[PDB]
């Protein structure tokens, strides 16, 4: 159809909108008087879905106050109308369609945001009722809208969350309603809001969200969830929780919500979620800000949980990934721990004639070998690239880095840092053991030292500048007393 067909439609809607509003004001409890215009409005709304197909003429909608009318209509006293509008809004903003016309799309988006679209969607949700199939579908379309908007443009997630979305999502997740498709959807949307968005992580924390997250996870601590969809939800929740843990402010909250105990329990009871519960543990401990958590871990016998996992790797989660988190956690513990807990941790490295140390060195040799092979492969790639005429650029460099990471760079680094910290503790047995074994193959003290220097260069991206010198300093301190 043509902009002759379309331009009609909008203004028709406006008339039908305005008229319906007027009539509804005039006869607040005489249904008879507004009803046929109610139907007229509904029909015109349904017919609009058409417009999605023409992505540019979106610019038009804005101009003739269509958008604004729509936004108002999510407040319309009759849920049948608002659901219909929601559906229309979801069709308009279906992401494939948007990537047809970025100009029509862009201005529509701008209009939508400027109107507090998310806030009005949430208001609508607050009065929807899911025991009624069309309403429940309204919720789903609502969520779909925000998923579409996030995909088209990130910056707004911060504003949207504060516009009551995040809080509603939390309420929905804690709601005592059987798991259903909406809940799953909620779980992914929350995760989408939370990646890279610290004000939302913070906001979640303030909203007491950490508790909520832990309780849902609580649910499947001993048993697995009923269906594949519910397990995907769990994974979603886990992701969200890890995101939240990137913010320092949230480590305290985790601690006081007994997050640590829970994850420990999960690790002991060998659920599939355990692969994730290891990740969570890792996140909960990484930086200086994971110091209290590190100590509490030891207090609750985390050591007994973690060391068996260190000694043996059980086989979605691969062997490498499993080792990675464990070693990372150990690294964090060696960094942050102090006093009795630290002493206890070191005792593990002495025990059974430093079997842990023998483990460590075994791991080292495993990952090192891999690393060597990958780096050789990368060398060969370079040479061939030169021969052909292909220029090594940023994309080729990132691809190489990914390949290296796959081979276990981070875990290697972690191992080596453990080795270093261990040796720096005044324990002859340990140093002897390390040096014994290196010289048992010869290969070697400098290698480790090189590896540690590489690690020191890089991390952190990072949080503070002054911090980053000091950390490098302390790492290098470990290299002399080796």
Numbering used by the authors: 77 to 391, 397 to 563
Give the original sentences from the paper that presented this experimental model:
CTNNBL1 is a spliceosome-associated protein that binds nuclear localization signals (NLSs) in splice factors CDC5L and Prp31 as well as the antibody diversifying enzyme AID. CTNNBL1 is a widely expressed, highly conserved 62 kDa nuclear protein that associates with components of the RNA splicing machinery. CTNNBL1 comprises a HEAT-like domain (including a nuclear export signal), a central armadillo domain, and a coiled-coil C-terminal domain.
We crystallized full-length human 6xHis-CTNNBL1 and N-terminally truncated 6xHis-CTNNBL1Δ76 (to generate a fragment that is necessary and sufficient for NLS-peptide binding). However, despite excellent continuity within the protein chain, we were unable to resolve any density for the N-terminal (76) amino acids in the structure of full length CTNNBL1. The N-terminus contains a disordered region and a structured HEAT-like region that includes a functional NES.
